[PDB]
Structure formats: C-alpha cells, structure tokens
Amino acid sequence: MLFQNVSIAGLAHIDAPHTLTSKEINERLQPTYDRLGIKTDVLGDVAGIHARRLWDQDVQASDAATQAARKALIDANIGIEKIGLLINTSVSRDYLEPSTASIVSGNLGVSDHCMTFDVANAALAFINGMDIAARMLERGEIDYALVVDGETANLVYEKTLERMTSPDVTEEEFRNELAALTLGCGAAAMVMARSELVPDAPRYKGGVTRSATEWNKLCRGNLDRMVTDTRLLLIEGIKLAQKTFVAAKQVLGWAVEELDQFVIHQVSRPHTAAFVKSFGIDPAKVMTIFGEHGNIGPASVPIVLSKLKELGRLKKGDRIALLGIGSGLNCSMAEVVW
Amino acid sequence: VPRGSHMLFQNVSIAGLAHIDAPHTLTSKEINERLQPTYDRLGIKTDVLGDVAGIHARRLWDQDVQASDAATQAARKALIDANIGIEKIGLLINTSVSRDYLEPSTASIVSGNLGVSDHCMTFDVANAALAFINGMDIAARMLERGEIDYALVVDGETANLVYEKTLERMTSPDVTEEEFRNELAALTLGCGAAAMVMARSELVPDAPRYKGGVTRSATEWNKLCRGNLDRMVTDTRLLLIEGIKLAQKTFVAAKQVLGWAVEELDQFVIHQVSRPHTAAFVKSFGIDPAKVMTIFGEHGNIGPASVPIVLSKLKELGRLKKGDRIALLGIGSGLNCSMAEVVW
Numbered sequence: 001m002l003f004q005n006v007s008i009a010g011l012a013h014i015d016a017p018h019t020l021t022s023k024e025i026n027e028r029l030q031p032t033y034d035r036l037g038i039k040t041d042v043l044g045d046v047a048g049i050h051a052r053r054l055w056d057q058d059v060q061a062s063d064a065a066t067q068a069a070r071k072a073l074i075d076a077n078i079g080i081e082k083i084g085l086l087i088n089t090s091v092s093r094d095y096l097e098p099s100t101a102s103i104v105s106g107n108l109g110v111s112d113h114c115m116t117f118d119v120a121n122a123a124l125a126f127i128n129g130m131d132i133a134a135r136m137l138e139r140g141e142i143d144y145a146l147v148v149d150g151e152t153a154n155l156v157y158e159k160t161l162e163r164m165t166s167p168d169v170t171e172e173e174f175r176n177e178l179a180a181l182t183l184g185c186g187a188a189a190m191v192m193a194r195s196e197l198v199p200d201a202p203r204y205k206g207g208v209t210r211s212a213t214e215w216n217k218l219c220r221g222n223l224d225r226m227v228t229d230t231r232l233l234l235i236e237g238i239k240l241a242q243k244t245f246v247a248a249k250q251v252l253g254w255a256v257e258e259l260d261q262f263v264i265h266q267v268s269r270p271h272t273a274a275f276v277k278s279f280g281i282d283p284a285k286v287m288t289i290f291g292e293h294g295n296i297g298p299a300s301v302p303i304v305l306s307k308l309k310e311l312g313r314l315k316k317g318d319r320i321a322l323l324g325i326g327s328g329l330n331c332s333m334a335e336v337v338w
Numbered sequence: 339v340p341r342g343s344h345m346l347f348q349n350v351s352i353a354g355l356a357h358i359d360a361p362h363t364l365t366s367k368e369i370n371e372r373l374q375p376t377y378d379r380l381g382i383k384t385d386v387l388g389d390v391a392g393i394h395a396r397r398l399w400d401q402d403v404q405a406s407d408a409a410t411q412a413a414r415k416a417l418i419d420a421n422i423g424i425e426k427i428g429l430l431i432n433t434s435v436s437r438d439y440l441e442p443s444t445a446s447i448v449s450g451n452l453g454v455s456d457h458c459m460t461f462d463v464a465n466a467a468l469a470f471i472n473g474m475d476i477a478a479r480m481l482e483r484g485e486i487d488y489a490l491v492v493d494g495e496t497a498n499l500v501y502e503k504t505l506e507r508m509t510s511p512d513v514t515e516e517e518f519r520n521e522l523a524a525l526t527l528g529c530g531a532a533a534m535v536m537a538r539s540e541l542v543p544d545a546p547r548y549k550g551g552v553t554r555s556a557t558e559w560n561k562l563c564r565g566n567l568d569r570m571v572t573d574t575r576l577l578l579i580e581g582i583k584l585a586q587k588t589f590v591a592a593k594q595v596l597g598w599a600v601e602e603l604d605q606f607v608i609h610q611v612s613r614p615h616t617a618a619f620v621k622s623f624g625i626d627p628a629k630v631m632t633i634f635g636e637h638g639n640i641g642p643a644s645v646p647i648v649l650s651k652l653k654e655l656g657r658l659k660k661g662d663r664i665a666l667l668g669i670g671s672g673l674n675c676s677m678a679e680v681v682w
Contacts, residue, residue: 091440091441095564095565096437096464096565097564097565097570098466098560098564098670098672099464099465099466099672100464101465102465102466102555102557102671102673103557105557105560106558106559106560109558110557112554112556112584113554113555114557115553115555116555116557116672116674117464117472118462118463118465119461120437120443120462121460121461122441122446123441125461128461135476135479135480135483139345209459210456211446211456211457213454216447216449216450217450219441220439220441220442221439221440221441222440223440243456326442327442327446328442328443328446329446330446330461
C-alpha cells in the first residue's frame with residue numbers, strides 16, 4: 001500500500017544572502033515595544049529566532065526556486081530534458097496566473113512533455129508535492145520529477161515593519177502580526193525518480209495526513225501581511241498531530257525509537273519543543289535551522305533534509321520522518337528510507 | 339493482442355457535478371458606454387468586446403464574495419447531485435485562479451465551511467485555466483489506487499476586482515493605447531463556480547467514467563498572460579498563434595493515447611478565451627461546431643471553472659446520454675494544453 005518504486009534522486013537548497021538579525025529588528029521596533037509595555041524580546045527570547053535571511057531586491061519566488069532546481073539537477077546528475085513533471089509548492093507566488101511552476105520551467109528550459117503546476121497548502125505543500133509526484137512516478141507516467149519551492153519574505157518584512165513603527169499602531173494588531181517577523185527566505189528543490197533508474201538512492205515511502213480545517217482562520221498570510229493566533233495554533237496543531245501519529249503507527253508501522261531522524265517543519269522554538277515532548281522524540285534526532293533562518297514555510301522540511309544530506313548525517317538504511325503541521329490546519333507525516 | 343492501459347485511469351467515475359452562475363449581469367454595452375471617451379480618444383470605432391471578442395455580458399458577484407464562498411456554494415450543490423454527505427469525502431482540491439490568501443489554501447477554507455472530516459486531505463492546485471483538469475487527475479490517481487472513496491474538486495472565480503480596477507485604468511484620460519490593448523482581455527473574464535464529486539466506480543456503477551488524458555507544454559511562452567487580483571495583461575495575438583501550435587502537438591498525443599478521432603467524440607467541452615480563438619481552434623482540428631457548447635457570450639471566460647461549468651450545464655440541459663464520449667480540452671496560460679476524456 002505504501003510507495004514501492006519511488007526514490008529521491010537529488011536534493012538541494014539555497015540560503016538567501018542577506019542577514020537581518022533580530023537585534024537589528026528590535027532596534028527598529030523598540031519605541032513601539034515600550035509604548036505597548038512589551039518588555040520581553042518576543043523574537044529572540046520567546047520565539048527563538050535570532051536572524052533570518054532576505055533575498056536581494058527584486059528576487060521573485062520563481063528566481064529562487066529556479067536556483068534551487070538547477071542545483072538539485074546537478075545533485076541528481078541529470079539534465080532538465082529528463083524531467084517529466086515540475087511542481088512548485090511555495091506559498092510565495094509571482095502571479096495568480098500563470099503558475100509559478102511554468103515560470104521556473106521556462107527558466108530551466110523543460111521539454112514540451114513536461115507537466116507543470118503549483119500546489120498550495122501552507123507549510124505542508126512540499127510533502128503534498130512529493131506525494132503527487134510519487135503517484136505519477138509509481139504509475140509510470142514520468143521517470144523524474146522536480147518539486148521546487150522558493151519563498152520570499154522581503155515584502156512582508158518591509159511592510160510589517162513600516163506598519164509597526166508608525167506611532168499610531170495598536171496592540172491586538174501587534175501580537176497578531178508578530179509571527180510575520182519569524183518568516184525567512186530560502187529555497188529548495190528535489191528530484192524524485194523511479195527507483196529502477198537510481199539504485200542506491202533514498203526511497204520515499206509516502207505517509208499519512210489528518211486535518212482540522214475548522215481552524216483555517218488561525219494563520220492568514222498574504223504578500224505583505226501575516227496574521228496568526230500563535231497560542232491556539234500550537235495547541236490545536238499538536239492535538240491534530242496526535243491523530244496523525246496514530247495513523248502513522250498503523251500505516252507506516254512507526255514507533256518513535258525506531259526512527260533515525262525527524263525532519264520537522266518549524267514555527268517557533270517553543271512549538272518545536274512542545275511537539276518533541278508530546279511524542280517523546282529524542283531532541284537529538286531533530287535538526288533545527290529556525291534560529292538563524294526562521295520559518296521558510298513549505299521549503300523548511302526539504303531545506304533541512306538537504307542540509308542533513310550535505311552534512312553527512314544520513315547513512316544508508318536510516319529511517320527518516322518528515323513531519324509538519326501546516327495552516328489549515330493540516331498535519332502530514334511521511335517516511336524516507338535513506 | 340494484449341494491450342496496456344496507456345496509463346489512463348481505470349474505475350474512476352464522476353458521481354456528481356454542479357455549477358453556480360454569479361447573480362449580477364454586466365453587459366458589454368454598459369462597459370462600452372464607460373469606455374466610449376477612451377475609445378474615441380484612441381480612434382477605436384469597432385466594438386472590440388461584443389463584435390471582436392464576442393462577449394455580450396458577464397456575471398459578477400457582490401463585492402464581498404470570496405473565491406472560497408463561490409466554491410463552497412458549488413460544492414454543496416455537487417454533493418446533492420452525488421447524493422452523498424460531506425463525511426464521505428476523503429480529498430478536496432481547490433483549483434481556482436482566484437485565492438482568498440497565499441496561506442492557507444482556499445481548499446482548507448472551503449473544507450471548513452463544508453465540515454469535512456479529519457481524514458479529509460485538502461490542498462490547492464494552480465495552473466491557470468487547466469487546473470480543474472489537473473485536480474481531477476490528482477483525485478483520479480488516488481481513487482484508482484483505492485486510497486479514498488470520494489473526492490471533491492472545487493473552483494470559485496471572482497473577477498469583480500479586475501473589472502473595477504481595469505475599468506478605472508482604461509477610463510483614465512492618460513491611458514496609452516499600449517496599456518489599453520494589454521488590459522483589454524480582462525474585460526472578457528467572468529465570475530462563476532463549479533464543483534465535481536469523483537468516486538471509485540464500484541460505488542457508482544452507472545456514473546460517467548473519467549479516463550484522464552494527455553498534456554503538452556510550451557513554457558517558453560509563460561509571459562503571454564499574467565494576472566493578479568486586480569489586473570490581467572494578455573498578448574491575445576500570440577496566445578492565439580502559440581496556443582494553436584501547442585494544441586496541435588497535444589492532439590497528436592491524444593490520438594496516440596486516447597485513440598481520438600474528432601468525428602467519434604460526442605461533445606467537446608473547450609476552455610474559451612474568445613469567440614475568434616475558439617473558432618480558430620475548432621477550424622484547426624475539424625471539430626463540428628454543433629458539438630461545442632459555449633457560455634462565453636453571456637458569461638465570459640470563467641478561468642479553470644469554465645470546463646466544469648460547461649459540462650454541468652450540458653448535464654442539466656439534458657444534452658448528455660449514456661455512452662457519449664466527451665472531450666475536455668483547453669489551452670491555459672503557461673502555456674499548457676490538456677485533453678482528457680469522460681465517457682458518460
């Protein structure tokens with residue numbers, strides 16, 4: 001019932017080049033903090049984000065995804081002519097029409113057989129994109145797929161910061177919009193393939209999803225604004241994950257001790273610590289880049305997986321859980337055997 | 339001689355289908371009256387909406403209707419058509435161009451409105467006017483595998499804002515001829531919504547079967563039509579030329595995998611961008627225009643909802659019979675072209 005012949009041929013990530021530290025942001029927001037009587041460092045100390053990266057001026061989501069895709073093609077040692085499907089999974093998008101995938105695909109020079117489209121599902125979309133690609137691979141529709149994701153937070157920072165340094169900004173608004181300053185830029189891409197083409201490549205098994213769509217108002221993001229009930233998002237997200245983990249026990253045969261790495265989408269340091277404690281996950285098996293890069297939306301999971309690969313942390317046979325709670329609320333859990 | 343499936347979908351059916359027509363009519367005559375001083379300044383003497391593009395009216399929602407609201411209205415009607423409750427739905431995919439937010443998916447909001455169960459998988463697909471077909475295929479792969487029993491594919495489009503802002507821009511005393519021509523196709527869009535319930539065929543033995551189909555792309559043309567919530571710029575001339583070239587490629591694939599010959603299909607449900615573009619398409623492939631229902635004249639171009647709205651109207655009008663082979667065809671910005679078959 002799980003995927004039998006679906007592999008990961010290549011994986012890459014791109015770190016955005018400009019550092020914006022929380023110290024620097026705080027220097028700018030300090031007058032407003034004081035007026036609200038905030039007092040704590042809600043970014044560095046509470047959320048646990050000390051920096052994030054921003055792109056150069058005028059870098060679009062498609063530019064970032066293209067850079068990651070070129071690097072993933074090199075990692076897979078294949079040319080773009082082999083790609084039969086390119087799915088863009090980012091929250092950021094160039095336009096409503098056409099798909100950002102078509103723009104990345106044009107940049108890369110895909111063939112006329114290549115099917116492309118975007119999937120949107122907040123932070124879980126890269127996993128959805130992997131599942132969608134796996135189903136096509138398993139059925140023999142394509143041999144290789146690219147799943148790409150470029151996130152830009154430049155505008156949300158610029159706008160939120162303006163809309164927070166106006167003296168006349170208010171306090172409900174303030175806490176509602178704080179989570180926007182935990183976002184970061186970055187990009188990732190993955191080449192997936194039919195297993196008989198790539199012996200020795202990691203195997204993607206697929207996984208489980210549960211949802212709690214009654215909570216779809218808890219985090220609403222646009223190009224220039226994100227509004228988020230952080231507290232409620234944490235509790236309801238972890239309750240949802242409890243259902244999903246029960247599901248994963250049954251269909252994936254999961255037991256926490258037997259998994260070798262947990263690659264977890266991160267919203268905040270406390271959210272992550274709550275999640276880890278809830279499931280009794282060894283925190284050593286959880287790589288985190290949130291402190292320096294913040295929340296890179298649906299690129300977070302593959303950027304961390306790529307970093308684990310580049311560091312030499314993954315060995316043959318390792319059982320790797322990809323986990324995340326996405327705005328929706330949705331929770332997806334999936335396995336890769338390295 | 340043993341033959342394979344050609345990777346077409348097996349045992350996937352259409353259990354229910356519905357559309358919503360938006361309530362307010364905006365005529366091209368009214369639009370022309372507003373644009374008249376600009377037409378006169380630019381020397382435009384023909385009715386480029388009514389006579390050239392072939393659109394006499396389009397429907398609009400109220401200002402406060404979101405994509406998710408339109409989609410939910412369609413989904414409720416589709417569930418009734420399938421005679422199933424929302425608790426049977428294991429997948430819901432929203433395919434619209436219009437979006438409530440970047441995050442979360444419009445799908446999650448439609449799903450919350452409808453009250454889907456905690457087993458329901460949801461997400462959005464975006465692919466300009468072909469996304470509903472992408473949605474059907476994604477759902478089909480899951481239903482064929484037997485992972486779910488029923489899926490909803492939903493799409494609500496709202497063009498209110500693009501009308502309001504485009505008309506403001508085009509009535510500016512300073513609008514240039516170039517920007518006027520660039521924005522003109524935005525005045526051919528319309529609001530509306532569609533939804534479809536798909537199911538494993540074992541559950542609905544006498545329902546229409548969805549076979550899937552083929553796609554080809556020409557992504558070097560991804561700049562030809564670009565749209566955001568308040569503006570759409572379109573190179574209509576090149577969309578015509580490159581779109582037809584791409585459809586010819588896709589038609590070759592459809593012959594090979596679907597075994598299509600135009601004379602053997604009973605209906606063609608074609609995504610429409612304009613009357614002359616449709617006429618060129620039909621003429622290019624030798625399609626019988628009597629088998630092509632059009633709503634463009636009175637509803638305009640409803641984006642990815644166009645194909646399912648027209649299929650739903652065909653069903654409602656009593657134009658579809660058991661055994662009819664229905665071609666779903668379209669060229670969408672990208673450029674992409676997809677061709678798929680439903681056997682009624």
